[PDB]
Amino acid sequence: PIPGIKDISKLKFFYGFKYLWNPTVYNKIFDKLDLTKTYKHPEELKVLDLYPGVGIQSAIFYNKYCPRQYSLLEKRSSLYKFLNAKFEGSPLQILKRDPYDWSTYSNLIDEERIFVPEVQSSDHINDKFLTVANVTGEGSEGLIMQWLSCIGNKNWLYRFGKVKMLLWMPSTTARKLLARPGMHSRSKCSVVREAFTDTKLIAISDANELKGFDSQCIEEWDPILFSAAEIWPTKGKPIALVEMDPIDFDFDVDNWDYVTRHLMILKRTPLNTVMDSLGHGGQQYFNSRITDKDLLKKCPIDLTNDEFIYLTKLFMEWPFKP
Numbered sequence: 001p002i003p004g005i006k007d008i009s010k011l012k013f014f015y016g017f018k019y020l021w022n023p024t025v026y027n028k029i030f031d032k033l034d035l036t037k038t039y040k041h042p043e044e045l046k047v048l049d050l051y052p053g054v055g056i057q058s059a060i061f062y063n064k065y066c067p068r069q070y071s072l073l074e075k076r077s078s079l080y081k082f083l084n085a086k087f088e089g090s091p092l093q094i095l096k097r098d099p100y101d102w103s104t105y106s107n108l109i110d111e112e113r114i115f116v117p118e119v120q121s122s123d124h125i126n127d128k129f130l131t132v133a134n135v136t137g138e139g140s141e142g143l144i145m146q147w148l149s150c151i152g153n154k155n156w157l158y159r160f161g162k163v164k165m166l167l168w169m170p171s172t173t174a175r176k177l178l179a180r181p182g183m184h185s186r187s188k189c190s191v192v193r194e195a196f197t198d199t200k201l202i203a204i205s206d207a208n209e210l211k212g213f214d215s216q217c218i219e220e221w222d223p224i225l226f227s228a229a230e231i232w233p234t235k236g237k238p239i240a241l242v243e244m245d246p247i248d249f250d251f252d253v254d255n256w257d258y259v260t261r262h263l264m265i266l267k268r269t270p271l272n273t274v275m276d277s278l279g280h281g282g283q284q285y286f287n288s289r290i291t292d293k294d295l296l297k298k299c300p301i302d303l304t305n306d307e308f309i310y311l312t313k314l315f316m317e318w319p320f321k322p
């Protein structure tokens with residue numbers, strides 16, 4: 001049994017990261033997640049913790065599930081040193097490495113065999129591999145775009161199957177990510193998240209932030225609310241917990257990416273004028289394939305992913321395109 005960390009944590013920098021420190025909340029969250037509904041053999045489970053920070057979540061999770069292996073990747077020296085002292089002698093494996101560098105995994109998993117998960121058939125969420133990560137710091141919006149890309153190509157940690165992942169991140173980032181068609185928050189990442197995953201909002205630190213999300217989704221989600229006080233590094237923006245589960249898809253990622261990339265950079269432009277961005281003569285080509293027309297008056301910001309799939313299908317069938 002590992003020691004729960006309290007306001008000892010009231011002593012570091014964090015580089016823009018924020019952490020929930022109130023154990024009461026984590027319990028509500030873990031009760032809400034009901035992880036063992038999928039991980040029925042926790043003794044067998046292996047967990048990867050990216051940017052643990054204060055290891056409060058790590059100590060609580062471990063204390064509740066005793067996984068086969070819980071590994072924490074902390075790059076920040078002060079925090080690394082902190083965790084190193086607190087959990088000294090614990091079952092937790094604490095390594096100081098950049099969690100957001102491809103080289104780290106190539107070496108810890110492949111080369112050194114320090115942490116190697118069980119690969120499984122992507123017909124169901126991997127049930128022996130779980131990954132948790134804090135992305136509350138700077139550039140979370142970019143890190144997430146990259147993260148998504150790996151689901152699409154099955155790179156990185158996704159080469160092990162459909163692995164569940166719980167991520168903390170600024171609520172503003174969570175609002176773009178979970179944004180639905182038509183919303184102002186709609187961006188390329190919402191479309192990608194829609195296309196490759198089933199993500200649920202599990203917790204948020206500001207009841208005021210819920211208005212940015214879909215009222216209907218907030219319904220189905222019913223996310224645990226908590227305050228700014230339960231977040232250590234104070235005076236920071238509100239954070240949000242998301243459960244990200246990859247899903248199966250059957251379309252051409254390469255072309256789809258090309259099309260969505262172009263259309264979404266002009267997401268506010270009507271579909272009856274934006275097509276020439278795909279290539280010279282694009283509008284005239286597309287106006288001859290698209291019959292519906294009710295969607296010709298829309299904008300990319302209004303389209304669903306299925307509509308995008310349809311649009312890239314037309315793209316590939318574009319004749320005389322060397």
Ligand SMILES: [Xe]
Nearest residue numbers: 035036039065
């Ligand atoms: Xe678990």
Ligand SMILES: [Xe]
Nearest residue numbers: 105108109115
């Ligand atoms: Xe790793």
Ligand SMILES: [Xe]
Nearest residue numbers: 029057132166
């Ligand atoms: Xe969590």
